[PDB]
Amino acid sequence: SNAYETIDISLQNASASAIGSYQVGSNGAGTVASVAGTATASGIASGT
Amino acid sequence: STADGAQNAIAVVDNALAAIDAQRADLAAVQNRFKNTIDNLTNISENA
Numbered sequence: 001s002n003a004y005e006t007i008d009i010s011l012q013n014a015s016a017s018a019i020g021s022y023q024v025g026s027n028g029a030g031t032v033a034s035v036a037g038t039a040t041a042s043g044i045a046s047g048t
Numbered sequence: 049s050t051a052d053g054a055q056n057a058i059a060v061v062d063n064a065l066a067a068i069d070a071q072r073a074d075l076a077a078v079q080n081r082f083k084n085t086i087d088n089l090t091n092i093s094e095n096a
Binding site for chain 1: 055056058059062
C-alpha cells in the first residue's frame, strides 16, 4: 500500500535460438592460443 | 500509464486525503464549537 514498494522479476530475455552456451572455451576467439592446443618448448607458464 | 502513475498517484492521494481530512477536522471543531455555543446561548437566553 506504499509507493515504489514493488517486487521485481528477472524473466529471461528470450528462450529463442539465442540462448545456449555463453562460452568460447579456448583458442577460438580472435586468435589461437600460444600453448593451449599447441606444441611448445617450455610449456604452460606461471601466473594467474 | 507506465512508470510514473502507479506510484506518483499514491504519492499524491496520500497528502491529498491528509489535507481533506484535516479540513474535515477543522469543520468538525467549528461545529462542535457551534453546538457548545448554541447550548450556552440558549441557557443565557432562558436565564434572561
